[PDB]
Amino acid sequence: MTEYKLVVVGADGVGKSALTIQLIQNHFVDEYDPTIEDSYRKQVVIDGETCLLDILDTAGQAMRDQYMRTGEGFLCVFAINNTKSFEDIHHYREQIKRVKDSEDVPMVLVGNKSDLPSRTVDTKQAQDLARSYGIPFIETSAKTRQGVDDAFYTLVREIRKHK
Ligand SMILES: Nc1nc2c(ncn2[C@@H]2O[C@H](COP(=O)(O)OP(=O)(O)CP(=O)(O)O)[C@@H](O)[C@H]2O)c(=O)[nH]1
Ligand SMILES: O=C1N[C@H](c2c([C@H]3CCCN3)[nH]c3ccccc23)c2ccccc21
Ligand SMILES: [Mg+2]
């Protein structure tokens, strides 16, 4: 069984933990409990093959150089109602390029909080940014579970291609 080390990164509050907990536990955390560093594991079938997901949920607010070196793929999460978090994607992208010394690191752009009525980043904006970096884009809601499996499964597919 192939293991995949996945890292969830993004600004403080975009929903990194809520997305990961939805994937693992199938429920929505309404609380705001800032993360230091948590890991989760889940066995899944993706495209007919069992995969072990070893997922690191990171702080948005240390081990960063180390987890970027170890991580095989990155979910780069922003919130669709927070423009600052969208612009922060450039910073996370640049760091990952730096630590890994490559321009083709498996990544997926995730626009979370799609259920909220305060949208400030339209789908075209996000699709343009993802196209500019050569990565897929997935809209998610940790509240309704929209796109959660698809976001993580798409990242695994990007890792599979890279190997
Ligand atoms: N409506 C809605 N709320 C969400 C969604 N995702 C997260 N939230 C809410 O946003 C807040 C922050 O979510 P959380 O998962 O803690 O964000 P985080 O990026 O891990 C915060 P940190 O970087 O400090 O660990 C929580 O109150 C959570 O319920 C979503 O898809 N929809
Ligand atoms: O070299 C490191 N291995 C750690 C690790 C884990 C752990 C959790 C329980 C089993 N593997 N799963 C991961 C997923 C993505 C990236 C890093 C990890 C880690 C954590 C933090 C910093 C460096 C490192
Ligand atoms: Mg968190």
**Alpha-carbon span 98 to 10, nearest angstrom:** 17
How many distinct helices (H) and strands (E) make up the chain?
Answer: 6, 6
Phi, psi of 51 (to 5 degrees): -130, 145
Resolution of the experimentally solved model in angstroms: 1.5
Q: Which ranges constitute the DSSP H helices of the chain?
A: 16-25, 64-70, 83-87, 89-100, 123-133, 148-162
Domain range for 69: 1-163
Q: CA separation (Å) from 28 to 25, 54, 68, 113, 118?
A: 9, 20, 27, 12, 19
CB of 7 closer than 6 angstroms to any ligand 2 atom: yes
Per the CB < 8 A criterion, the answer to whether 107 and 72 are in contact is: no
Tokens of 6: 């996945």
Q: CA separation (Å) from 57 to 40, 127, 148?
A: 8, 24, 14
Tokens of 144: 């309704």
Q: What is the secondary structure of 99-113 as a DSSP string?
A: HHT-S---EEEEEE-
The total number of structural domains that make up the chain: 1
C-alpha 146 – ligand 1 centre gap (Å) = 14
Q: What is the CATH number of the domain that holds 158?
A: 3.40.50.300
> What residues flank ligand 1, with Cβ below 6 Å?
10, 12-18, 29-30, 32-35, 59-61, 112-113, 115-116, 141-143
Q: 109 has which bridge partners?
A: 76, 137
